[PDB]
Point group: D2
Chain length 507, copies 4
Amino acid sequence: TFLEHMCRLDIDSPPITARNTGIICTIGPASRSVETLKEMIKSGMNVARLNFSHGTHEYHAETIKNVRTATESFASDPILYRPVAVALDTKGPEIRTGLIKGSGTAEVELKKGATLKITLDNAYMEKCDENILWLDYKNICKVVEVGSKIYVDDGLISLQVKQKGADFLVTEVENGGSLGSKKGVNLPGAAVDLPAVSEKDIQDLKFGVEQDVDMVFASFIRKASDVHEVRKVLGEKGKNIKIISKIENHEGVRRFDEILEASDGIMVARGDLGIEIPAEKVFLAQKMMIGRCNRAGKPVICATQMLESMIKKPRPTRAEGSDVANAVLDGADCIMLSGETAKGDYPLEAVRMQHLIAREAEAAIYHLQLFEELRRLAPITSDPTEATAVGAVEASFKCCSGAIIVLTKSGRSAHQVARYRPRAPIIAVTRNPQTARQAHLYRGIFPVLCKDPVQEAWAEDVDLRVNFAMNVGKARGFFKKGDVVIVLTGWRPGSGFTNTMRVVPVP
Amino acid sequence: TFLEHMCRLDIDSPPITARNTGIICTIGPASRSVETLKEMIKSGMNVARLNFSHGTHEYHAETIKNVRTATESFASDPILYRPVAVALDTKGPEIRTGLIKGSGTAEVELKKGATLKITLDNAYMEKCDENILWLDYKNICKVVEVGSKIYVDDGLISLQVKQKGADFLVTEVENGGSLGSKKGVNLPGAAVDLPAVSEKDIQDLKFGVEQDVDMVFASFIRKASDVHEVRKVLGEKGKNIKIISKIENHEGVRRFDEILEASDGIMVARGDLGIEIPAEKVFLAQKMMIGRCNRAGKPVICATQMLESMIKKPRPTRAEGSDVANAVLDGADCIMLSGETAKGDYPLEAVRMQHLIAREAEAAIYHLQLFEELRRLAPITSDPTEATAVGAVEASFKCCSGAIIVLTKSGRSAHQVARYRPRAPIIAVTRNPQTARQAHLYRGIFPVLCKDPVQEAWAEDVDLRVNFAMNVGKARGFFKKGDVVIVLTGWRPGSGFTNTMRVVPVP
Amino acid sequence: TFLEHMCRLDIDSPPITARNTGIICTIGPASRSVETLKEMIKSGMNVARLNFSHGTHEYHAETIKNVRTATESFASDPILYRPVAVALDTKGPEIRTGLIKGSGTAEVELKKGATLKITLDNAYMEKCDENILWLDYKNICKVVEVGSKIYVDDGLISLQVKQKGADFLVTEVENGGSLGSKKGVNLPGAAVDLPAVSEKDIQDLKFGVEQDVDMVFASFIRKASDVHEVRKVLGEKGKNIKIISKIENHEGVRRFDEILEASDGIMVARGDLGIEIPAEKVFLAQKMMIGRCNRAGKPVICATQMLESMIKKPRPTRAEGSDVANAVLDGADCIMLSGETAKGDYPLEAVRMQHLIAREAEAAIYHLQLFEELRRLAPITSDPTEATAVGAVEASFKCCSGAIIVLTKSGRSAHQVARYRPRAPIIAVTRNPQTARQAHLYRGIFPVLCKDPVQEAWAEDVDLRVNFAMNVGKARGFFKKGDVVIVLTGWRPGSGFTNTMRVVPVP
Amino acid sequence: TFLEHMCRLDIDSPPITARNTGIICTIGPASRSVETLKEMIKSGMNVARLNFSHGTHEYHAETIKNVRTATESFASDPILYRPVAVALDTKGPEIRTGLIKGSGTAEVELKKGATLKITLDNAYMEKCDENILWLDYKNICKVVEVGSKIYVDDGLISLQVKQKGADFLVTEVENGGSLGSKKGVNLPGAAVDLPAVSEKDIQDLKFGVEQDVDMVFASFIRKASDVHEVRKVLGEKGKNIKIISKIENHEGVRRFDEILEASDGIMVARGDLGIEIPAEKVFLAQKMMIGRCNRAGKPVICATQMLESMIKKPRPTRAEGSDVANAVLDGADCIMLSGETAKGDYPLEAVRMQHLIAREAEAAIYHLQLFEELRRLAPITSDPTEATAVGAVEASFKCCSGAIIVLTKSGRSAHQVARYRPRAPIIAVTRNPQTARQAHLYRGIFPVLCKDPVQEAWAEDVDLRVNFAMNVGKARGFFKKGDVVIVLTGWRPGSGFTNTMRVVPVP
């Protein structure tokens, strides 16, 4: 009984299992130094997120350089080295207002009920007033109708369409407040037809490919074709880069299935969604998307103001503490920190609290129960790897194994085991550096980069990689000698196929 | 399947059922006027909470007066009138520091690692320094041990016990920051032996009895005897006043069962708990207590910074939106707003968002599933009312009734039906004004105060009260003519017993 | 866990609940005397079955007379009197062979592989040989095809269609054995188009109406229209007579749903079905039909050689003991004894063993579990009686009531409660003698015929009938003073509606 | 839903899976010829049971010789050859009466209520009368008490203890009937202390060892020590012989757990149990023991008059058809035929019907559901083989494999997979002839004896045995090329350990 499960939760019983959820940290002026980055990695950071909404390429190249400098600082000890991925989060397509009467700093607020006209006439670009407002979205009138709502400046200001002019709109200020220059606009429920990527996104994406980033968090994704566009721009040289689509508006939620199908992962951007749809429905959207991603076996990331308050506070608010725990309880693969680590004054404490909350939340989940539903909703397959994966997870529960060791080149086999959410951690051993880093996208996977040189005979090379995982598992305290672990590898060498599962006692 | 349930959640499908969770609003200078109170009642406020940590009796008497003035403003229409309860939240027992070197405003912050001594020698009362700190808890040394942790000023500052002097303690400043005068102290994990109520609490409680308040939110409850003390002080004249115990520390959580047994309800004070125990474990404590209260059939309240941000913002943060939704999804009977309605600048919007989030969260709960566990965990009874209650809930699901109408004097019968969490709303018809107000403590109960005069014959009086509920249900849109509703009353008059259930079509 | 349930079964723990399954006994020369009938009633017989395949009307009228003489022998004590129904089981439509070479006693067996022709030429009526066989089914050739199978003499002999002549058929004797005169023929899988009733059935049915029988077990039912025909023949004066359709062949099973819809009940005739379809599939057909009848809430009867062996043996075989127990475990409403009570030498022991097996089997069923599925498969209703019925059953489980007392005129309300299979017995109090007798068709219903005179005021008459049930429940040991019982009656008198449930302690 | 499962059963949909339940046939004068034995093997017989209650050693040696002659008749085709086991069923310990007045044929029946004395005085051995009855159980008086019941001649006659003399007993004939000479006696509920084996059993068991039988069905087992005794007698040379304990009386059921623990398997002897305990409780005992055996993973056999009627009838009764189906539905590993194949006139038809009923019953079982309970009740293990076994079963369901191929020497690994009841058949490949034969005791195991010569390299020998199973699976129609199968073998050669599972497509 679930209710009976809740009743049995105990705060006095320390979490036993390791923290399965990945932690993604936005890097900025307050966590940019190799020094701080080293600590953040020790504190649990698995992915470094660079927010391209701001900063120059040279600025970001140096951030990435420092991240790799700090990461390789631990390579002298292969057994403890933790791969650290680099994520590029695009500024993305957006609608900005013009400049209010000359200068930008100048603000012209207006009272509710008042009238306000939205003009596409470029003549009013740098001359916006409490009576006339210029926007850079040229199809604004075609995707909106009389009665539509329009938010200005991150939803701070609200408006409602009364009459649809030709190249303009007349609206009543439902809300109010200080209106500034070049502010972001949102069209709740409207099918915005802006290109999938902006011209700035294009160059940033190209930069990402040359910087060899592991994933891209693509903004404002609202249809499959938007994902394809992002994919096309990354091109042949960026084909292995994971594309995580950020669901930020109503159309994105409505066409979520086709978007998920086309993506490698998903990110619930509660911040923008909170503007785009009724704030009271965001928790529903988040839970729906996490659930579908878990069902599909694709990574899902939760972020957008998790532990915000921790900018100048030692500990998080109660709402934030609850939010991170429930996100992981919902089934999120990774939790992301923004601002709290990019700016703030407590970047380290923020990462540590994130880690603590996650492991507590994970200890409070009924793993066997979560797995039964996954296998239940999962269909009959003819793919031997899928069958091997489910059998390994089951065998793992039966002997309460210290881990499921998975040898993988591309990471696929490890991902297949991860979708079934075993309780035991998944130690994915690979010689591919990129696979090691990208693995953090999947909950429960603990990637380890095997340094040792390949062995002539495939059989010996397999034992070498398996024993490496064994030492890692021992070192990290996942298990010890005498315990039992599950191992997934292949039957023969040059044929490729993870269809072999072995139950082996730890040396 | 739960995962399958998550996958099916839809933000485009409006919530059908009414908002079952009660809304409690802290009243202060920003929501104290009869004018604003009238609006707050229309916006969903079921309970008015007065925070006695501040304000004079005369100040509170006027607040209560205005609340009743606004509430009775709607009595001209019995069909729509909504009872509104008054809750008294005690300042409670606490540990305060002395005055730092003379004046209070004077602050003397200290760096981490630095040494700090805690003295009970009253000679240092108004002379606290970064080297000496006076506290008013005289048994401080007896309930603490070397290694213990001590928080100062709402946990902003941290310390750790090194050596236990006689009437003092030497500690290292684990944290740091500006230290002020007369600040609240917390002893995480320590069995504080302060009296159940302070001398200020005593007079406030007495005041509550003379003001005829409906419930008391008793602070710092950590054992059954503390509840009894509160009960003793309210005395004979305050015997019908509901005592809701606020769990605010580790001992409170450890002895939760005996506290729940002795209380009428429970309040999870996440704010104080966040200080008293590891912040990462608060979500666990909240979920455990809500679950046990649901199992016991006793009211459970969640509060302590729900929609805080809404002090000068139109909409809540994403973490807060998630927090309120998950609290109701956890099974909380009421959600409380503090600051957001007491101070803030958007008291009305805050109440409305609270209501919106709650009904969305309720529409997203599998009612039949929630009920099956309750009846399952519920034991075999010999009490006819309990059996009548379960049968009414079941019959309610079978015909998808528009409501379960319960005639009750003390409210008990309505509470018994509420514990089984039917989907249909419970219309509790009573002639007892206090019962009507106190009913809001229980999720799903919609109290209606019957004005009509008692009828000579009990049979006619029953039909009169049942028909009143029918008109209320129609008026509020719970159901309409031709629908079916469940009615719970008694077999005979002067014998008292709600053991009769009828399934009746709506007139 | 079901497997865990099996593991916990204990033969050393006496059955607590009463025997819910009805017992139907075929009456014949060995159980026809008022003397033996009195004992059989004391031993558990609820229904007396007269097999009209044999015997004259005068012979049956006397049997019925004796049954009523024995039944009324117990009317001097209303509290213990047990209604006893009379069932008329029709000979039904059938295909008979002619007379083999002159006389009937003459048998002409044939060896397998041998050739045999089936002729419709009446010229061979009384001249059947191992080479020519006459049958009275004139459409035999139209409903059969080359390759079809034909059984002769209760399936003892088998044949297979080779060539379809004009008014005859040539077939190979797949089996073999002694062939007699005027033997019953079966056409497995063939859509036999014989009239729904034979001319003998017609007169027998008419006789049943004038004898005021309670139910009719209609033979060879294979389509809805067959049921209607039976209904039409019983006419206006036999409209209250329950029609139980006997599923005896493949078409009957294929069109079971439409037959169930049209019938009042169902009887699985394993004997004939064993011939009509592959013997190895009969257990499947029985379980399917019992399940669908339980789902539909319609009576289902299992018979056809239950405790056969008990013709000259003190105790039943092991296969028979298993068969009766599993039939009740499957959900059968009644179990029928044929031959064992009609002929045999141990009619009394047979009835007693039947009763013993049934109560043991019932004690071994998880009642709450059986009920949950019923309510689950049961749809949302708008019928108040259905809702009242489910709520009464639920309340019954909650207080582990000694019984659910149902006041009913037609018996409908009692039937509605019976479909939900409560653990507590259902005491159906009625003043209608026929309702009392027919109630035995439903498992769990204990009918009691109230003798007392109707009371002027409806309220007093209700209490009179409820108290009668109370005394009956006490007398029969279902419960005692201080226990709790569920009572189902109506709100008002001349309006008719069992929508009122009360939980009352036993006086 | 189970009820919903019953409703969906269809007699028109042919069973897809193969017949998993083993068939055991008693061999006698009517199935003793190599000719008939060849047919019986083709018809499904997996085990030949010799009933040692009758016949000489020379007689049985010839039966066994003929069984092996018929079995080896199919060895010319390794792909289709079916191992056939030989079972020795002991006469067992029993209580016999003396000779009635001189000769044995002489019978002296007595009427009920009459008095009858039981004497241990050997002087009355060959002089038994309706007044005096001699029994060979010398401790009869010590294990019985006043009021005890005593059955004579297979329960045909009943008696009840009135006064306990010194070396005799006085009893009233509760029943009645013809009393013969040297008849079997039963003491229901009495703790009979006869030795575990009789002197005849001892020699028969010795004979079994020299005849190299595969299993022994030990009679009258009622305590663990009885099993040990049987084990001791079989000695070192008979240590691999499987001991199946026959539960035949109340003490046997009461001490079932310790008996199961000590045994290799269990046989529910409904015939004797029907005498020893109330006939109405036998179905309960059978279901309990089958359930516990399934939980323990030990073979359970059901027999004692399954298809008895088929002595001179083409098809079985309806009660018998139901009995065999329900026994398999209960979870029995094997069903046994006695008399129907030993004597009868339709030994072949009996075996075929047995096979048909079993596969129909198996097609009607929810395999996945049956497996979930087994794994649920199954505890956490540290044994890699157990974990490998569960993972193989799970992987089997995931890809709906055509079979689980298990390489085994002793058969243990195959047994471990069998306890989890996969839907796919288990092809146990072994080079040990005895293992192949004994495997039939476990439901779902299809043993195949690999003839091919061992290969130098273990890796090649494994592929050779796996490919043999593949050809067998294809030949028998379990699966075909392109399908997927699960394979269980070991990691390395001379280390022994079935901890390796592979999912492989069929060649």
